[PDB]
From Swiss-Prot:
This is Virion morphogenesis protein OPG132. The gene is OPG132. Keywords: Host cytoplasm, Virion. It comes from Vaccinia virus (strain Copenhagen) (VACV). One of its GO terms (cellular component) is virion component. Belongs to the orthopoxvirus OPG132 family. Lipid-bound viral membrane assembly protein that plays an essential role in immature virion (IV) to mature virion (MV) transition. Functions in both crescent-shaped viral membranes formation and its enclosure to form immature virions. In addition, participates in targeting mature virion proteins to sites of virion assembly to ensure their proper localization.
Amino acid sequence: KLRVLYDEFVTISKDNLERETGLSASDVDMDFDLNIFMTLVPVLAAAVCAITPTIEDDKIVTMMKYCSYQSFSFWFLKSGAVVKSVYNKLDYVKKEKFVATFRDMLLNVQTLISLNSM
């Protein structure tokens, strides 16, 4: 299920990043990116609020402000764009779906951290 979420995140991100920058994406490496998210989860939770199933959309959007695409496999060091820059280009319905996708990704990654911790 994480793979489906991640592919969706990547597909939406690439299309918008490419349209904005005229640049091409680099190869996708999910395991690399999951590891990046594992670093991001605790920092986002500390800087914004706890990541739980009930987290407000507004809080997720704030987290998107601080997540830089330069860190991910498919946009590695390409530009300084953050996730909110992609969110900003989506229509009303797609913004809502993107928030859900990102939230659920973060929740799944946090589950992995919890597993590894135990």
